[PDB]
Amino acid sequence: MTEYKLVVVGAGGVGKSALTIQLIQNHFVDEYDPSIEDSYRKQVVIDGETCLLDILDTAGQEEYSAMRDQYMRTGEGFLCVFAINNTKSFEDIHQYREQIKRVKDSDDVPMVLVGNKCDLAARTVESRQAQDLARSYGIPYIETSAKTRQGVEDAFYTLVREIRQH
Ligand SMILES: Nc1nc2c(ncn2[C@@H]2O[C@H](COP(=O)(O)OP(=O)(O)NP(=O)(O)O)[C@@H](O)[C@H]2O)c(=O)[nH]1
Ligand SMILES: [Mg+2]
């Protein structure tokens, strides 16, 4: 078994914590702790390869960049969570990547861009725009929904692929 430190990122309400709680507890946060260091780790099998998945759930921009260096430096990969309905996410998701290149000290970093909230009926950022970043960054683009729970794990699994490749 291998330990995969999955460092999740988010502007706050993009669904970062929603994807984690789903991939771990599998449910919609109705009264869970408001952001904490109590990271989680689930055991799965990537293409017939049993390995551990330690998904770290950080805070949503609550003044703690100092710790961001401790996690990012210890994270095997990064997952960019953006809301198709919230254009704000697409904004922070851009600068967010720049933070990784700094810590990792290299443009080549294993990460994935997921589009949470793919169930809502009021999307602002079309797949085209979301693809621009994934195509410009050279990373995969997956769509999921914490509410309906569609291809949720599909987004996480993709991360393991990027890492393994590197
Ligand atoms: N409609 C819809 N809402 C979602 C979906 N996923 C998450 N949400 C909701 O959108 C909001 C996102 O913020 P929240 O759940 O508080 O997570 P958070 O903001 O990261 N917590 P915090 O800010 O304390 O770190 C919550 O109400 C969350 O339940 C989704 O797929 N569809
Ligand atoms: Mg949160």
Coordinates of N, CA, C and O and ligand atoms in Angstrom, one line a residue:
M1 N 0.8 -1.2 0.0 CA 0.0 0.0 0.0 C 0.9 1.3 0.0 O 1.9 1.3 0.6
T2 N 0.4 2.3 -0.7 CA 1.1 3.5 -0.8 C 0.3 4.7 -0.3 O -1.0 4.7 -0.4
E3 N 0.9 5.7 0.3 CA 0.2 6.8 0.9 C 0.2 8.0 -0.1 O 1.3 8.5 -0.5
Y4 N -0.9 8.4 -0.5 CA -1.1 9.5 -1.4 C -1.6 10.8 -0.7 O -2.8 10.9 -0.5
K5 N -0.8 11.7 -0.4 CA -1.2 13.0 0.2 C -1.9 13.9 -0.8 O -1.3 14.6 -1.5
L6 N -3.3 13.8 -0.8 CA -4.1 14.6 -1.7 C -4.4 15.9 -1.0 O -5.3 16.0 -0.2
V7 N -3.7 17.0 -1.4 CA -4.0 18.3 -0.9 C -5.1 19.0 -1.7 O -4.8 19.4 -2.9
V8 N -6.2 19.2 -1.1 CA -7.3 19.8 -1.8 C -7.3 21.3 -1.5 O -6.9 21.8 -0.5
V9 N -7.7 22.1 -2.5 CA -7.8 23.5 -2.4 C -9.1 24.1 -2.8 O -9.9 23.4 -3.6
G10 N -9.5 25.3 -2.4 CA -10.7 25.9 -2.7 C -10.8 27.3 -2.2 O -10.2 27.7 -1.2
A11 N -11.7 28.1 -2.8 CA -11.9 29.5 -2.4 C -12.7 29.6 -1.2 O -12.7 30.7 -0.5
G12 N -13.4 28.5 -0.8 CA -14.2 28.5 0.4 C -15.5 27.8 0.2 O -15.8 26.8 0.9
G13 N -16.3 28.2 -0.8 CA -17.6 27.5 -1.0 C -17.6 26.9 -2.4 O -18.7 26.7 -3.0
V14 N -16.5 26.5 -3.0 CA -16.4 25.9 -4.3 C -16.7 24.4 -4.2 O -17.0 23.9 -5.3
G15 N -16.6 23.9 -3.1 CA -16.9 22.4 -2.9 C -15.7 21.6 -2.5 O -15.7 20.4 -2.6
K16 N -14.7 22.3 -2.1 CA -13.4 21.6 -1.7 C -13.7 20.7 -0.6 O -13.3 19.5 -0.7
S17 N -14.3 21.1 0.5 CA -14.6 20.3 1.6 C -15.7 19.4 1.3 O -15.8 18.3 2.0
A18 N -16.6 19.7 0.4 CA -17.7 18.9 0.0 C -17.2 17.6 -0.7 O -17.8 16.5 -0.5
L19 N -16.2 17.7 -1.5 CA -15.7 16.6 -2.3 C -14.9 15.7 -1.3 O -15.0 14.4 -1.5
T20 N -14.2 16.2 -0.3 CA -13.5 15.4 0.6 C -14.4 14.6 1.5 O -14.3 13.4 1.6
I21 N -15.4 15.3 2.2 CA -16.3 14.7 3.0 C -17.1 13.6 2.3 O -17.5 12.6 2.9
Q22 N -17.3 13.8 1.0 CA -18.0 12.8 0.2 C -17.1 11.6 -0.1 O -17.5 10.4 0.0
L23 N -15.8 11.8 -0.5 CA -14.9 10.8 -0.7 C -14.5 10.0 0.5 O -13.9 9.0 0.5
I24 N -14.9 10.6 1.7 CA -14.5 10.0 3.0 C -15.8 9.4 3.7 O -16.0 8.2 3.8
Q25 N -16.6 10.3 4.2 CA -17.9 10.0 4.8 C -19.0 9.7 3.9 O -19.9 8.9 4.2
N26 N -18.9 10.3 2.7 CA -19.9 10.1 1.7 C -21.3 10.7 2.1 O -22.2 9.9 2.5
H27 N -21.4 12.0 2.1 CA -22.6 12.7 2.6 C -22.5 14.2 2.4 O -21.4 14.7 2.2
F28 N -23.6 14.9 2.5 CA -23.7 16.3 2.4 C -23.5 17.0 3.8 O -24.3 16.8 4.7
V29 N -22.5 17.8 3.9 CA -22.2 18.5 5.1 C -23.4 19.3 5.6 O -23.8 20.3 5.0
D30 N -24.0 18.9 6.7 CA -25.1 19.6 7.3 C -24.8 20.2 8.6 O -25.5 21.1 9.1
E31 N -23.8 19.7 9.3 CA -23.4 20.2 10.6 C -22.0 19.8 10.9 O -21.7 19.6 12.1
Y32 N -21.1 19.6 9.9 CA -19.7 19.1 10.2 C -18.9 20.3 10.6 O -19.2 21.5 10.5
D33 N -17.7 20.0 11.2 CA -16.8 21.0 11.7 C -16.4 22.0 10.6 O -16.1 21.6 9.5
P34 N -16.4 23.3 10.9 CA -16.1 24.3 9.9 C -14.6 24.4 9.7 O -13.9 25.2 10.3
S35 N -14.1 23.6 8.8 CA -12.7 23.5 8.4 C -11.9 23.2 9.6 O -12.0 23.7 10.7
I36 N -11.0 22.2 9.4 CA -10.1 21.7 10.5 C -8.9 20.9 9.9 O -8.9 20.5 8.8
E37 N -7.9 20.7 10.8 CA -6.7 19.9 10.4 C -7.0 18.4 10.5 O -6.1 17.6 10.2
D38 N -8.2 18.0 10.9 CA -8.5 16.6 11.0 C -8.7 16.0 9.7 O -9.7 15.5 9.3
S39 N -7.5 15.9 8.9 CA -7.5 15.3 7.6 C -8.0 13.9 7.6 O -8.1 13.3 8.7
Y40 N -8.4 13.4 6.5 CA -8.9 12.0 6.4 C -8.1 11.2 5.4 O -7.4 11.8 4.5
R41 N -8.2 9.9 5.4 CA -7.4 9.0 4.5 C -8.2 7.7 4.3 O -8.5 6.9 5.2
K42 N -8.6 7.5 3.0 CA -9.4 6.4 2.6 C -8.5 5.4 1.8 O -7.6 5.8 1.0
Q43 N -8.8 4.1 1.9 CA -8.1 3.1 1.1 C -8.9 2.6 -0.1 O -10.0 2.1 0.1
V44 N -8.3 2.8 -1.3 CA -9.0 2.4 -2.5 C -8.0 1.6 -3.4 O -6.8 1.4 -3.1
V45 N -8.5 1.3 -4.6 CA -7.7 0.5 -5.5 C -7.7 1.2 -6.9 O -8.7 1.2 -7.6
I46 N -6.6 1.8 -7.2 CA -6.4 2.6 -8.5 C -6.1 1.6 -9.6 O -4.9 1.2 -9.8
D47 N -7.1 1.2 -10.5 CA -6.8 0.3 -11.6 C -6.2 -1.0 -11.1 O -5.3 -1.5 -11.7
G48 N -6.8 -1.5 -10.0 CA -6.3 -2.8 -9.5 C -5.1 -2.6 -8.6 O -4.3 -3.6 -8.4
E49 N -4.8 -1.4 -8.1 CA -3.7 -1.1 -7.3 C -4.1 -0.5 -6.0 O -4.3 0.7 -5.8
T50 N -4.3 -1.4 -5.0 CA -4.7 -0.9 -3.6 C -3.7 0.0 -3.0 O -2.5 -0.3 -2.9
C51 N -4.1 1.2 -2.7 CA -3.3 2.3 -2.2 C -4.1 3.2 -1.3 O -5.3 3.4 -1.5
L52 N -3.4 3.8 -0.3 CA -4.1 4.8 0.6 C -4.2 6.1 0.0 O -3.3 6.6 -0.8
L53 N -5.3 6.8 0.3 CA -5.5 8.2 -0.2 C -5.8 9.2 1.0 O -6.9 9.3 1.4
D54 N -4.7 9.8 1.4 CA -4.8 10.8 2.5 C -5.2 12.2 2.0 O -4.4 13.0 1.6
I55 N -6.5 12.4 1.9 CA -7.0 13.7 1.5 C -7.0 14.7 2.6 O -7.7 14.6 3.6
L56 N -6.2 15.8 2.5 CA -6.1 16.8 3.5 C -7.0 18.0 3.2 O -7.0 18.6 2.1
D57 N -7.9 18.3 4.1 CA -8.9 19.3 3.9 C -8.4 20.6 4.7 O -8.6 20.6 6.0
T58 N -7.9 21.6 4.0 CA -7.5 22.8 4.7 C -8.6 23.8 4.9 O -9.8 23.4 4.6
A59 N -8.3 25.0 5.3 CA -9.3 26.0 5.5 C -9.6 26.8 4.3 O -8.7 26.8 3.4
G60 N -10.7 27.5 4.3 CA -11.0 28.4 3.1 C -10.5 29.8 3.3 O -11.3 30.7 3.7
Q61 N -9.3 30.1 2.9 CA -8.7 31.4 3.0 C -9.1 32.1 4.4 O -9.9 33.0 4.4
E62 N -8.5 31.6 5.4 CA -8.7 32.1 6.8 C -7.4 32.5 7.4 O -7.2 32.3 8.6
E63 N -6.5 33.1 6.6 CA -5.2 33.6 7.1 C -4.4 32.5 7.8 O -4.5 32.3 9.0
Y64 N -3.7 31.7 7.0 CA -2.9 30.6 7.5 C -1.9 30.1 6.4 O -1.6 29.0 6.3
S65 N -1.4 31.1 5.6 CA -0.5 30.8 4.5 C 0.8 30.1 5.1 O 1.4 29.3 4.4
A66 N 1.1 30.4 6.3 CA 2.3 29.8 7.0 C 2.2 28.3 7.0 O 3.2 27.6 6.7
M67 N 1.0 27.7 7.2 CA 0.8 26.3 7.3 C 0.7 25.7 5.8 O 1.0 24.6 5.6
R68 N 0.2 26.6 4.9 CA 0.1 26.1 3.5 C 1.4 25.6 3.0 O 1.4 24.7 2.1
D69 N 2.5 26.1 3.5 CA 3.8 25.7 3.0 C 4.2 24.3 3.6 O 4.9 23.6 3.0
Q70 N 3.6 24.0 4.8 CA 3.9 22.8 5.5 C 3.1 21.6 4.8 O 3.6 20.5 4.6
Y71 N 1.9 21.9 4.4 CA 1.1 20.9 3.7 C 1.5 20.7 2.2 O 1.7 19.6 1.8
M72 N 1.5 21.9 1.5 CA 1.9 21.8 0.1 C 3.2 21.1 -0.1 O 3.3 20.3 -1.0
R73 N 4.2 21.4 0.7 CA 5.5 20.8 0.7 C 5.4 19.3 1.0 O 6.3 18.5 0.6
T74 N 4.3 18.9 1.7 CA 4.1 17.5 2.0 C 3.0 16.8 1.2 O 2.8 15.6 1.3
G75 N 2.5 17.6 0.3 CA 1.4 17.1 -0.6 C 2.0 16.5 -1.9 O 2.7 17.1 -2.6
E76 N 1.6 15.3 -2.2 CA 2.0 14.6 -3.4 C 1.3 15.2 -4.6 O 1.8 15.0 -5.7
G77 N 0.2 15.8 -4.4 CA -0.6 16.4 -5.5 C -1.6 17.4 -5.0 O -1.8 17.6 -3.8
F78 N -2.2 18.2 -6.0 CA -3.1 19.2 -5.6 C -4.4 19.1 -6.5 O -4.3 18.9 -7.7
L79 N -5.5 19.3 -5.9 CA -6.8 19.3 -6.7 C -7.5 20.6 -6.7 O -7.8 21.2 -5.6
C80 N -7.7 21.2 -7.8 CA -8.4 22.5 -7.9 C -9.9 22.4 -8.1 O -10.4 21.8 -9.1
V81 N -10.6 22.8 -7.1 CA -12.1 22.7 -7.1 C -12.7 24.0 -7.4 O -12.5 25.0 -6.7
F82 N -13.5 24.0 -8.5 CA -14.2 25.3 -8.9 C -15.6 25.0 -9.2 O -16.0 23.9 -9.7
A83 N -16.5 26.0 -9.0 CA -17.9 25.9 -9.2 C -18.3 26.5 -10.6 O -18.0 27.6 -10.9
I84 N -18.9 25.6 -11.4 CA -19.3 26.1 -12.7 C -20.3 27.2 -12.7 O -20.4 28.0 -13.6
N85 N -21.0 27.3 -11.6 CA -22.0 28.3 -11.3 C -21.4 29.6 -10.7 O -21.9 30.7 -10.9
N86 N -20.3 29.4 -10.0 CA -19.6 30.5 -9.4 C -18.3 30.8 -10.1 O -17.3 30.1 -10.2
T87 N -18.3 32.0 -10.8 CA -17.2 32.5 -11.5 C -16.0 32.9 -10.6 O -14.9 32.9 -11.0
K88 N -16.3 33.2 -9.4 CA -15.3 33.6 -8.4 C -14.3 32.5 -8.2 O -13.1 32.7 -8.1
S89 N -14.8 31.2 -8.2 CA -13.9 30.1 -8.0 C -12.9 30.0 -9.2 O -11.7 29.8 -8.9
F90 N -13.4 30.2 -10.4 CA -12.5 30.1 -11.6 C -11.4 31.2 -11.5 O -10.4 31.1 -12.1
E91 N -11.6 32.2 -10.6 CA -10.7 33.3 -10.5 C -9.6 32.9 -9.5 O -8.4 33.0 -9.8
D92 N -10.0 32.4 -8.3 CA -9.0 32.0 -7.3 C -8.3 30.7 -7.7 O -7.2 30.4 -7.4
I93 N -9.0 29.8 -8.5 CA -8.4 28.6 -8.9 C -7.2 28.8 -9.8 O -6.3 28.0 -9.9
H94 N -7.2 30.0 -10.5 CA -6.1 30.4 -11.3 C -4.8 30.7 -10.5 O -3.8 30.2 -10.7
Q95 N -5.0 31.7 -9.6 CA -3.9 32.1 -8.7 C -3.5 31.0 -7.8 O -2.3 30.9 -7.4
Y96 N -4.4 30.1 -7.4 CA -4.1 29.0 -6.6 C -3.0 28.1 -7.1 O -2.1 27.7 -6.4
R97 N -3.1 27.8 -8.4 CA -2.1 27.0 -9.1 C -0.7 27.7 -8.9 O 0.3 27.0 -8.7
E98 N -0.6 29.0 -9.1 CA 0.6 29.7 -8.9 C 1.3 29.4 -7.6 O 2.5 29.4 -7.5
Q99 N 0.5 29.3 -6.6 CA 1.0 29.0 -5.2 C 1.7 27.7 -5.2 O 2.7 27.5 -4.5
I100 N 1.2 26.7 -5.9 CA 1.8 25.4 -5.9 C 3.2 25.4 -6.6 O 4.2 24.9 -6.1
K101 N 3.3 26.0 -7.8 CA 4.5 26.2 -8.5 C 5.6 26.8 -7.7 O 6.8 26.5 -7.8
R102 N 5.2 27.6 -6.7 CA 6.2 28.3 -5.8 C 6.7 27.3 -4.8 O 8.0 27.1 -4.8
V103 N 5.9 26.7 -4.0 CA 6.3 25.7 -3.0 C 7.1 24.6 -3.7 O 8.2 24.3 -3.4
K104 N 6.4 23.9 -4.6 CA 7.0 22.8 -5.3 C 8.3 23.2 -6.1 O 9.2 22.4 -6.3
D105 N 8.3 24.5 -6.4 CA 9.5 25.1 -7.1 C 9.6 24.4 -8.5 O 10.7 24.1 -8.9
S106 N 8.5 24.3 -9.2 CA 8.5 23.7 -10.5 C 7.1 23.8 -11.1 O 6.1 23.6 -10.4
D107 N 7.1 24.1 -12.4 CA 5.8 24.1 -13.1 C 5.2 22.7 -13.3 O 3.9 22.6 -13.3
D108 N 6.0 21.7 -13.4 CA 5.5 20.4 -13.5 C 5.1 19.8 -12.2 O 5.9 19.3 -11.4
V109 N 3.8 19.8 -11.9 CA 3.3 19.3 -10.6 C 2.0 18.5 -10.9 O 1.1 18.9 -11.7
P110 N 1.9 17.4 -10.2 CA 0.7 16.5 -10.4 C -0.5 17.1 -9.7 O -0.7 17.2 -8.5
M111 N -1.5 17.5 -10.5 CA -2.7 18.1 -10.0 C -3.9 17.9 -11.0 O -3.7 17.4 -12.1
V112 N -5.1 18.2 -10.6 CA -6.3 18.0 -11.4 C -7.3 19.1 -11.1 O -7.4 19.6 -10.0
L113 N -8.0 19.5 -12.2 CA -9.0 20.5 -12.1 C -10.4 19.9 -12.2 O -10.8 19.4 -13.2
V114 N -11.2 20.0 -11.1 CA -12.5 19.4 -11.0 C -13.6 20.5 -11.0 O -13.4 21.6 -10.5
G115 N -14.7 20.3 -11.6 CA -15.8 21.2 -11.7 C -17.0 20.8 -10.9 O -18.0 20.3 -11.4
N116 N -16.9 21.1 -9.6 CA -18.0 20.8 -8.6 C -19.3 21.5 -9.0 O -19.3 22.5 -9.8
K117 N -20.4 21.2 -8.4 CA -21.7 21.8 -8.6 C -22.1 21.7 -10.1 O -22.5 22.7 -10.7
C118 N -22.0 20.5 -10.6 CA -22.4 20.2 -12.0 C -23.8 19.8 -12.1 O -24.2 19.2 -13.1
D119 N -24.6 20.0 -11.0 CA -26.0 19.6 -11.0 C -26.9 20.8 -11.0 O -28.0 20.8 -11.6
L120 N -26.4 21.9 -10.5 CA -27.2 23.2 -10.5 C -27.8 23.5 -11.8 O -27.3 23.0 -12.9
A121 N -28.7 24.4 -11.9 CA -29.4 24.8 -13.2 C -29.0 26.3 -13.5 O -29.8 26.9 -14.2
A122 N -27.9 26.7 -13.0 CA -27.5 28.1 -13.3 C -25.9 28.2 -13.4 O -25.3 28.8 -12.5
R123 N -25.4 27.6 -14.4 CA -23.9 27.6 -14.6 C -23.5 28.9 -15.3 O -24.2 29.3 -16.3
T124 N -22.4 29.4 -14.9 CA -21.8 30.6 -15.5 C -20.6 30.3 -16.4 O -20.4 30.8 -17.5
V125 N -19.7 29.5 -15.8 CA -18.5 29.1 -16.5 C -18.7 27.8 -17.3 O -18.8 26.7 -16.7
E126 N -18.8 27.9 -18.6 CA -19.0 26.8 -19.5 C -17.7 25.9 -19.5 O -16.6 26.3 -19.1
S127 N -17.9 24.6 -19.9 CA -16.8 23.7 -20.0 C -15.6 24.2 -20.8 O -14.4 23.9 -20.6
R128 N -15.9 25.1 -21.8 CA -14.9 25.7 -22.6 C -13.9 26.4 -21.8 O -12.7 26.2 -21.9
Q129 N -14.3 27.3 -20.9 CA -13.4 28.1 -20.1 C -12.6 27.2 -19.1 O -11.4 27.3 -19.0
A130 N -13.3 26.3 -18.5 CA -12.7 25.3 -17.6 C -11.6 24.5 -18.3 O -10.7 24.1 -17.7
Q131 N -11.8 24.2 -19.6 CA -10.9 23.5 -20.4 C -9.6 24.3 -20.7 O -8.5 23.8 -20.8
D132 N -9.8 25.6 -20.8 CA -8.7 26.5 -21.1 C -7.6 26.4 -20.1 O -6.4 26.2 -20.4
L133 N -8.0 26.4 -18.8 CA -7.0 26.2 -17.7 C -6.4 24.8 -17.7 O -5.2 24.7 -17.6
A134 N -7.2 23.8 -17.8 CA -6.7 22.4 -17.9 C -5.9 22.2 -19.1 O -4.9 21.4 -19.0
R135 N -6.2 22.8 -20.2 CA -5.4 22.7 -21.4 C -4.2 23.5 -21.4 O -3.1 23.1 -21.9
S136 N -4.2 24.7 -20.7 CA -3.1 25.6 -20.6 C -2.1 25.1 -19.6 O -0.9 25.2 -19.7
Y137 N -2.7 24.4 -18.5 CA -1.8 23.9 -17.5 C -1.4 22.5 -17.8 O -0.5 22.0 -17.1
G138 N -2.0 21.9 -18.7 CA -1.7 20.5 -19.1 C -2.2 19.5 -18.1 O -1.7 18.3 -18.1
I139 N -3.3 19.8 -17.4 CA -3.9 19.0 -16.5 C -5.3 18.5 -16.9 O -5.9 19.2 -17.7
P140 N -5.7 17.4 -16.4 CA -7.1 16.8 -16.8 C -8.2 17.7 -16.2 O -8.0 18.4 -15.2
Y141 N -9.4 17.6 -16.8 CA -10.5 18.3 -16.3 C -11.7 17.4 -16.2 O -12.2 16.8 -17.1
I142 N -12.2 17.3 -14.9 CA -13.3 16.4 -14.6 C -14.5 17.2 -14.0 O -14.2 18.2 -13.4
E143 N -15.7 16.7 -14.2 CA -16.9 17.4 -13.6 C -17.6 16.5 -12.6 O -17.9 15.4 -12.9
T144 N -17.9 17.1 -11.4 CA -18.6 16.3 -10.4 C -19.6 17.2 -9.7 O -19.7 18.4 -9.9
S145 N -20.3 16.6 -8.7 CA -21.3 17.4 -8.0 C -21.4 16.8 -6.6 O -21.8 15.6 -6.4
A146 N -21.2 17.6 -5.5 CA -21.3 17.1 -4.2 C -22.7 16.9 -3.7 O -23.0 16.1 -2.8
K147 N -23.7 17.6 -4.4 CA -25.1 17.5 -4.1 C -25.7 16.2 -4.7 O -26.2 15.3 -3.9
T148 N -25.5 16.0 -6.0 CA -26.0 14.8 -6.6 C -25.0 13.6 -6.5 O -25.4 12.4 -6.6
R149 N -23.8 13.9 -6.3 CA -22.7 12.9 -6.2 C -22.5 12.2 -7.5 O -22.8 11.0 -7.6
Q150 N -22.1 12.9 -8.5 CA -21.8 12.4 -9.9 C -20.4 12.4 -10.2 O -19.7 13.5 -10.3
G151 N -19.8 11.2 -10.5 CA -18.4 11.1 -10.8 C -17.5 11.8 -9.8 O -16.4 12.2 -10.1
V152 N -18.0 11.8 -8.5 CA -17.2 12.4 -7.4 C -15.8 11.7 -7.3 O -14.8 12.4 -7.4
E153 N -15.8 10.4 -7.1 CA -14.6 9.7 -7.0 C -13.8 9.7 -8.3 O -12.5 9.6 -8.3
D154 N -14.4 9.9 -9.4 CA -13.8 10.0 -10.7 C -12.8 11.1 -10.7 O -11.7 11.0 -11.4
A155 N -13.1 12.2 -10.1 CA -12.2 13.4 -10.0 C -11.0 13.1 -9.1 O -9.8 13.4 -9.5
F156 N -11.2 12.4 -8.0 CA -10.1 12.1 -7.1 C -9.2 11.1 -7.7 O -8.0 11.3 -7.7
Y157 N -9.7 10.0 -8.2 CA -8.9 9.0 -8.9 C -8.0 9.6 -9.9 O -6.8 9.2 -10.0
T158 N -8.4 10.6 -10.7 CA -7.6 11.2 -11.7 C -6.3 11.7 -11.1 O -5.3 11.7 -11.7
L159 N -6.4 12.3 -9.9 CA -5.2 12.8 -9.2 C -4.2 11.8 -9.1 O -3.0 12.0 -9.3
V160 N -4.6 10.6 -8.6 CA -3.6 9.5 -8.4 C -2.9 9.2 -9.7 O -1.7 8.8 -9.7
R161 N -3.6 9.3 -10.9 CA -3.0 9.1 -12.2 C -1.9 10.1 -12.5 O -0.8 9.7 -12.9
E162 N -2.1 11.4 -12.2 CA -1.2 12.4 -12.5 C 0.1 12.2 -11.7 O 1.2 12.2 -12.2
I163 N -0.1 11.9 -10.4 CA 1.1 11.6 -9.5 C 1.9 10.4 -10.0 O 3.1 10.6 -10.3
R164 N 1.2 9.3 -10.2 CA 1.9 8.1 -10.7 C 2.7 8.4 -11.9 O 3.9 7.9 -12.1
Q165 N 2.2 9.2 -12.8 CA 2.9 9.6 -14.0 C 4.2 10.2 -13.7 O 5.2 10.1 -14.5
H166 N 4.3 11.0 -12.6 CA 5.5 11.7 -12.2 C 6.3 10.9 -11.2 O 7.1 10.1 -11.6
Ligands
LIG1 N1 -26.2 23.3 -4.8 C1 -25.1 22.7 -4.4 N2 -24.5 23.1 -3.2 C2 -23.3 22.5 -2.8 C3 -22.7 21.5 -3.5 N3 -21.6 21.2 -2.9 C4 -21.6 21.9 -1.7 N4 -22.6 22.7 -1.7 C5 -22.9 23.7 -0.6 O1 -22.4 25.0 -0.9 C6 -21.8 25.5 0.3 C7 -20.3 25.4 0.2 O2 -19.7 25.9 1.4 P1 -19.6 24.9 2.7 O3 -20.4 23.7 2.5 O4 -19.8 25.7 4.0 O5 -18.1 24.4 2.7 P2 -16.9 25.5 3.1 O6 -17.3 26.8 2.8 O7 -15.6 25.0 2.5 N5 -16.8 25.4 4.7 P3 -15.8 26.6 5.3 O8 -16.1 27.9 4.6 O9 -16.1 26.6 6.8 O10 -14.3 26.0 5.1 C8 -22.4 24.6 1.4 O11 -23.7 25.0 1.7 C9 -22.2 23.3 0.7 O12 -23.1 22.3 1.4 C10 -23.3 21.1 -4.7 O13 -22.7 20.3 -5.4 N6 -24.5 21.7 -5.2
MG2 MG -14.0 24.4 4.0

